[PDB]
Design a binder for this molecule. Sequence first.
Ligand SMILES: Cc1nc(=O)c2cc(CN(C)c3ccc(C(=O)N[C@@H](CCC(=O)O)C(=O)O)s3)ccc2[nH]1
Ligand SMILES: Cc1nc(=O)c2cc(CN(C)c3ccc(C(=O)N[C@@H](CCC(=O)O)C(=O)O)s3)ccc2[nH]1
Ligand SMILES: *c1cc(=O)[nH]c(=O)n1[C@H]1C[C@H](O)[C@@H](COP(=O)(O)O)O1
Ligand SMILES: *c1cc(=O)[nH]c(=O)n1[C@H]1C[C@H](O)[C@@H](COP(=O)(O)O)O1
Lengths: 288, 288
Amino acid sequence: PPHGELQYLGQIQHILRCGVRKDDRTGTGTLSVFGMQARYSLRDEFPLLTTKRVFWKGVLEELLWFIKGSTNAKELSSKGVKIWDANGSRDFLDSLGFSTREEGDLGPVYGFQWRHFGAEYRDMESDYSGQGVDQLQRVIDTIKTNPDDRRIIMCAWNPRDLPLMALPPCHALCQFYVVNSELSCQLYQRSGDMGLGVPFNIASYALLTYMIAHITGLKPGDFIHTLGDAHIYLNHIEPLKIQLQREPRPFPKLRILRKVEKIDDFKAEDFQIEGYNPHPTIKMEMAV
Amino acid sequence: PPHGELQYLGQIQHILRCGVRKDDRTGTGTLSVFGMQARYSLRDEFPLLTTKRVFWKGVLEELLWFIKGSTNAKELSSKGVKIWDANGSRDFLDSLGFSTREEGDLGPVYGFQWRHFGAEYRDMESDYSGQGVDQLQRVIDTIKTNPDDRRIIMCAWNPRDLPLMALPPCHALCQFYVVNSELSCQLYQRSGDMGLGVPFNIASYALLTYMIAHITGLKPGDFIHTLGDAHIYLNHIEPLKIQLQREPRPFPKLRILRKVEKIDDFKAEDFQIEGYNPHPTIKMEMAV
Ligand SMILES: Cc1nc(=O)c2cc(CN(C)c3ccc(C(=O)N[C@@H](CCC(=O)O)C(=O)O)s3)ccc2[nH]1
Ligand SMILES: Cc1nc(=O)c2cc(CN(C)c3ccc(C(=O)N[C@@H](CCC(=O)O)C(=O)O)s3)ccc2[nH]1
Ligand SMILES: *c1cc(=O)[nH]c(=O)n1[C@H]1C[C@H](O)[C@@H](COP(=O)(O)O)O1
Ligand SMILES: *c1cc(=O)[nH]c(=O)n1[C@H]1C[C@H](O)[C@@H](COP(=O)(O)O)O1
């Protein structure tokens, strides 16, 4: 079969060639296409793009960070991953009307929604243990007791909390699916920065599926990536054209070195990416 | 000029050919595939399937019923559309442990979530005016003022309310998009009964897009249908095979018979499907 990475490269080709110029919140301007989907096999291979070196350390730490239910950019930043620090800045928080909010407090985003959906948000320092719906655990439990369930959904998009977010989730929800001992996951990404966030986001959900398959005794199946506003920022056009001239390389594999029982038990050292031979890193300037 | 209906027919082919046997909640059994996407153009045509006659009256009536904010099956039944009566019957309600609920009360379903997301659900007769988030109107307001917004989402999936729903929404959420004066809509349907619900569902959202496009002064663009568990029930394989032998006929057109100002203003007589010439109707027994 063909290299799964060609789907992503193909989506980049399409947007660059046929995407429509669409202004945006950041003011950078974009080339956009509405509605896209790709299927990444998770069977004996891991979808970490090769046409560009993907910041894997960032992916792994962000997910563990999400899993802990943290909304403090400081805690992830202490791991050497600064991807969310800009959004927790004093200046940025103020530009949204969050002047009384401490620096690093991203609001009730991902982690908070996944583990405490519906809980009354105070601040990043608050203890929400036992508050709200722990969707992640409910998803894990359902997969174990009734794998045929067609309602295995973890939703980050919370209408009543959007006002408190420094940035509404680019990932509204994801759905899990089990058939013949294989676990699949589909992500609905309402908005996708193709050159920066997407490659990262793909690896992230592929990792989450591996983690959940591991503790549920299942084999990773497919990761389906569904996009809403799939866009390429104007300043990413040139670097993306360089990346398109690169031939994909066999996807690496992901090894889980230890037998884990609970999702909260995983640690960075538990994972190992082997056979990852990517082309040189390509810098995509952040939009703001 | 590939006919738009070929996508739905191709999805049926794929599932019959590659779908995997998967038991289900109803005990009927299905052929299943996880993750699918189809794009139905809404430009000078309406995607009402022709390889079988679709119950358009039901489609229109159900959507007007959603907009009214109703969660009472009887209010739709009184229009001659009985699609939700079973899910509101005494026996079915009792089977889910809702014996204290009145017959016809579907719980916090679409009507409620769309117009009062977050509000505390009491019963189908309660007045929720001013309670919760009226996502529908907010969506309309944003389309009219900031069309580039990548967060135009209407969510029906509410983790907090699920334990009260007679049937968790098969349509988790939808996202709207605007470019070149065209309004597009993507639906994330977590579970799709390909033979029964899907054809109907596709018409439902195409209609919603036509409605919003009308009140916002935009032209309908694309309707992207995204599926989670796309399945063909076993007792639908024979009739679907017959349907697949039928050549689609040009899609009809949808006419709005007068300038409507507000979404709540639409009445059934404001719409006319013209040039609809479907093949004979194909009954698809309900599963359970
Ligand atoms: C416009 C915009 N696009 C984004 O993709 C985006 C992403 C995040 C958060 N996030 C989920 C991120 C994932 C990956 C990131 C990133 O900057 N990656 C660089 C790595 C450079 C480095 O830190 O060493 C890269 O992949 O090149 S940032 C926050 C705001 C955003 N804003
Ligand atoms: C297993 C199952 N599949 C469904 O598609 C489904 C749909 C609803 C509600 N819904 C959203 C529906 C949309 C269309 C419907 C339907 O029965 N359509 C028939 C029409 C027969 C008639 O004319 O009355 C059809 O299209 O053949 S039902 C409730 C439970 C379900 N249960
Ligand atoms: C958000 C977060 C993420 O994990 N990955 C992403 O791709 N993004 C991107 C999408 C978009 O360019 C921007 C968020 O902006 P908006 O809310 O869509 O306006 O970050
Ligand atoms: C639900 C409602 C709708 O509008 N469209 C649909 O196709 N369905 C289908 C999907 C599934 O076969 C069943 C609902 O069951 P479940 O909750 O997925 O188990 O009806």
